[PDB]
Design a protein that fits this description.
6 chains, A little secondary structure, C alpha/beta, E alpha+beta, F mainly alpha, F: mainly alpha
């Protein structure tokens, strides 16, 4: 959370959070645009 | 036994944090490195030093033991896990219950149940470092 | 071949028998066997111990008479409480926490007889005011050293306050296997009985003693503090203007402000008021 | 809670201060019925993250009896643990040089055990045993003392990976491999508990079943600790009876594990029957292993009480036995943790500075 | 905000003052506990000279000149260089 | 915010007291450590 304090939210990206990006935790992402993209496998 | 307890405590305070929090972080890490390489120390002092090094580098700056929760309450499983680990004077072989005290952090953006989105975040504050500095 | 951070629940009366037997046979290095039982591997408990006269031969296995030991054991079984023999004790005025060559040999014979037969070194002469030494160890075979040495098992308990003596380190004992931690059976109905009854001062706090030796004691007190007068005098003219701590370190005198502190004056003050209050309390009682 | 917009943070958090497991179960049901994916999904994790034992179990029971199956799975946390595992696989960081200099620091003392634990702490959740396997093989000379710590090291590296780590530890069957090294079997059970940590239900069941059908020599130590680890706070009847039978049989060699398991199963329950059984057994027995394990059991027998712990610990931490003093304050310390409880801190510091008893 | 913050603040600071004040009785007792130093019949080995503080060289009557530690109870007030002094029986320490 | 300031002053009074009580306890404990040494 200290790193989150100095963190900057990238609003330029297609993904925007519903839960505020100020406190660490799990957040569900909003239903993205049609023809879903941006998939990663960590 | 006080010296090894201080080393374990100084390691526990320094988990998951780099030198940005305090310039002494690198000094203590090199202190832990030189005492674990110093094999002429006492058995108990060396034992706690190595446990200090293990808990400090627990998972490779990946997992951490924290009593603070998301809303700030105590995480009782972690509390007793530290209690059992602290109870090395009673029984060192019985003091290995700390594995349940793992409290990792993650900012997830999982919209689906299986699909993992490319939820990515940025940073712009220069005095901030983490994610495996690789000291030695 | 398992010897963890073992602890001995030695009993207080066993201690008293040890000190009495050592005080009786001081220069003779009197021998005895610690009457204990292995309730398990490492929580050995000793409730009783006996005193045996060392034979004229010296430290020998035959000095501990087998028939006499057997008759003593039968007497304990009939009257008292039976207890096994898994240890021995010996007043050791010669040197410290280690065992002499003959002591090692007779302990080896005891180890052959018993399972451990702990080697306990109690020094009757070094124990004078505050420190009594009771160190227990085990003799090992040659196999323990060629395998992973330091038979001290994997735990962080016997490393607490484990300071073997330098003479014990260079002997095999206290170095062959480990040093056994000691514990005292300070159980209640036993410990509360000792503190309440043995150290008995219950109506002796009513003593008055106004001036039995105190008029001349006050004369001495005034004279001693007159010396403090000169000392606290000497200080005020020293009192140099160069950070007087600099002067004090190289010119220590142990004067009233430095070493003969206010605590000594408090002792004199407490002595006076105590006699005052006791005399005044009984004065109002005198009705 | 009554705000028109069902915001996540206010309704998840306020309901647990007021202790309304039924109400938060009802709102989750309405979110499931309306199929508000963001609201229902986020609130369920937030309930899982912010609530604790006896709360999340109550809510899921009232929720079970459109997204109900998803809420049940995510409240159980298996997906969250799996996400932690996969992150621990990806962003894991190991230091080979630190593995070697610890191996250099290996000596005949207990220090070699420390090195193995430290390397395993660095290798936690790697699902790959080559460096650690070689280190264990190199240190496979001082057994019958260091197996318990070595199997602890294997437990932490393969924790929460019962799909394959169960077989990886099952490759150490004790009877045929080594009868002489009696800690081979106790290490096997101990790693099973550590590997299957954060896993209950069927995990509790086969642990207790094999603990019923086994010896009482060494297997009971790791098995009881693993049983309590899987049944943390459950206090289910079958494990409690086994633990009570083990405790009152006066099997002192295992009573340390039995007492530790008692605390885990009565984690936070404030069971007056449990504490009186623990206290009563303390005066009856005079074994250090029993005392230390019973010290653990009384330590985590309750937390967050603030109504009974103050009087209970004033009676227990004052008691004759220093172990009872140490365990008594363990209870009050974690029963008043989370807030600056003046009375608890008063008693905690008073026993620190007044009595000279070292324990 | 700061109203209750200072309220609780007053409480906590006040508590640690009294709690830490409770040990002075314990520590006066401890200070009076450690001053036993045997308090028992001593012996004589003549002092050679006070080399420094906390270090000294004494000569027992049989010779056996060995370095000892000088306690702070007695010092230069009667620590003349070559006068006969008293030392513990089994400790041989300057008293 | 007036009872605020009054309580701060009473906080300040106690904190000034508690400075030396900690220091007195620490220095005497050092003395006990010295005599034990």
């Amino acid at each position: 959370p200290a790193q989150l304090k100095v963190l900057t939210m990238p609003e330029t990206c297609r993904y925007q959070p519903f839960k505020p990006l100020s406190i660490g935790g799990i957040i569900i992402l909003k239903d993205t645009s049609e023809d879903i993209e941006e998939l990663v496998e960590p | 036994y006080v010296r090894q307890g201080a080393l374990i405590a100084s390691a526990l305070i320094m988990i998951q944090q780099t030198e940005i929090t305090c310039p002494k972080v690198n000094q203590f890490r090199q202190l832990y490195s030189k005492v674990i390489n110093d094999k002429h120390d006492d058995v108990m002092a060396k034992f706690g030093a190595i446990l200090a090094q293990g808990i400090l580098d627990a998972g490779g700056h990946n997992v951490t033991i924290s009593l603070q929760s998301r809303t700030g309450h105590t995480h009782m499983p972690s509390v007793v896990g530290v209690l059992v680990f602290t109870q090395f004077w009673f029984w060192f072989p019985l003091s290995h219950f700390l594995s349940l005290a793992y409290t990792p952090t993650c900012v997830i953006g999982l919209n689906k149940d299986l699909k993992m989105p490319k939820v990515q975040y940025k940073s712009n504050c220069k005095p901030s470092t983490f994610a495996y500095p690789a000291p030695l | 071949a398992v010897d963890t951070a073992e602890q001995v629940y030695i009993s207080s009366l066993a201690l008293l028998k040890m000190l009495k037997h050592g005080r009786a046979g001081v220069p003779m290095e009197v021998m005895g066997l610690m009457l204990g039982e292995f309730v398990d591997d490492y929580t050995v408990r000793v409730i009783d111990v006996f005193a045996m006269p060392q034979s004229g031969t010296g430290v020998s296995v035959e000095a501990v008479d087998p028939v006499f030991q057997a008759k003593m054991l039968d007497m304990l079984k009939q009257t008292g409480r039976p207890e096994m023999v898994v240890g021995w004790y010996h007043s050791h005025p010669g040197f410290g926490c280690w065992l002499s060559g003959v002591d090692i040999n007779t302990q080896q014979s005891f180890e052959a007889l018993s399972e451990r037969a702990v080697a306990v070194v109690v020094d009757p002469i070094q124990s004078v005011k505050g420190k009594v030494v009771i160190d227990a160890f085990r003799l090992i075979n040659a196999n323990m050293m060629v395998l992973g040495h330091e038979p001290r098992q994997t735990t962080s308990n016997l490393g607490h306050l484990n300071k073997p003596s330098i003479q014990a380190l260079i002997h095999g004992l206290n170095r062959h296997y480990y040093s056994i931690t000691i514990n005292y059976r300070k159980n209640e109905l036993e410990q509360k009985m000792l503190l309440n009854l043995h150290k008995k001062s219950w109506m002796e706090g009513l003593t008055l003693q106004d001036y039995s030796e105190h008029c001349k004691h006050n004369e001495s007190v005034v004279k001693e503090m007159l010396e403090l007068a000169k000392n606290y005098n000497k200080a005020v003219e020293e009192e140099d203007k160069m950070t007087p701590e600099q002067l004090a370190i190289k010119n220590v005198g142990k004067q009233d402000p430095k070493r003969h502190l206010e605590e000594h004056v408090d002792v004199l003050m407490t002595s006076n008021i105590v006699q005052c209050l006791a005399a005044m309390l009984d004065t109002v009682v005198f009705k | 809670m009554n705000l028109e917009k069902p915001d996540f943070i206010n309704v998840c958090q306020c309901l647990i201060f007021l202790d309304d497991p039924q109400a938060v179960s009802d709102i989750l049901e309405k979110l499931v019925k309306e199929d508000n994916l963001l609201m229902a999904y986020q609130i369920c994790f937030d309930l899982y993250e912010s609530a604790s034992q006896q709360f999340l179990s109550s809510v899921i029971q009232n929720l079970r009896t459109d997204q109900t199956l998803k809420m049940i799975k995510i409240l159980s946390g298996e997906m969250a643990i799996e996400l932690h595992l996969q992150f621990l696989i990806r962003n894991n960081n190991t230091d080979l040089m630190i593995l070697k200099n610890t191996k250099d620091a290996v000596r005949n003392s207990v220090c070699h055990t420390a090195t193995v634990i430290a390397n395993s702490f660095m290798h936690c959740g790697t699902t790959s045993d080559q460096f650690l396997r070689d280190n264990l093989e190199w240190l496979a000379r001082a057994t019958n003392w260091a197996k318990f710590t070595a199997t602890a090291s294997l437990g932490v590296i393969h924790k929460g990976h019962e799909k394959e780590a169960l077989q990886l530890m099952a490759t150490y069957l004790p009877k045929d491999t080594s009868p002489g090294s009696a800690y081979q079997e106790g290490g096997g059970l101990y790693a099973l508990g550590l590997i299957h940590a954060n896993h209950g239900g069927d995990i509790i069941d086969y642990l207790l079943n094999q603990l019923k059908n086994a010896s009482n020599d060494i297997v009971r130590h790791g098995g009881s600790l693993g049983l309590g680890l899987a049944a943390m706070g459950t206090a289910r009847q079958d494990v409690y009876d086994l633990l009570k039978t083990n405790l009152y049989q006066d099997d002192a060699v295992t009573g340390e594990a039995a007492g530790l398991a008692l605390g885990l199963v009565m984690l936070g329950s404030k069971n007056a029957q449990a504490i009186e059984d623990m206290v009563g057994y303390a005066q009856e027995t005079q074994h250090e292993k029993i005392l230390r394990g019973l010290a653990v059991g009384i330590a985590l027998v309750m937390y967050g009480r603030m109504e009974e712990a103050d009087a209970l610990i004033e009676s227990l931490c004052r008691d004759k036995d220093p172990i009872l003093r140490r365990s008594g304050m363990y209870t009050v310390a974690m029963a008043y943790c989370g807030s600056g409880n003046n009375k608890a801190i008063r008693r905690l510091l008073h026993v620190a500075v007044s009595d000279v008893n070292d324990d | 905000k700061l109203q209750q913050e200072l309220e609780f603040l007053e409480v906590q600071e006040e508590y640690i003052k009294d709690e830490q004040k409770n040990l002075k009785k314990e520590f006066l007792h401890a200070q009076e506990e450690v001053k036993r130093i045997q308090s028992i019949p001593l012996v004589i080995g003549q002092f050679l000279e006070a080399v420094d503080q906390n270090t000294a060289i004494v000569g027992s009557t049989t010779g056996s000149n060995y370095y000892v530690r000088i306690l702070s109870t007695i010092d230069r007030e009667l620590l003349k260089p070559n006068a006969s002094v008293a030392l513990h029986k089994h400790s041989n320490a300057l008293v | 915010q007036y009872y605020l300031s009054k309580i701060e002053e009473l906080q300040l009074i106690v904190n000034d007291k508690s400075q030396n009580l900690r220091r007195l306890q620490a220095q005497r404990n050092e003395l006990n450590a010295k005599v034990r040494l």
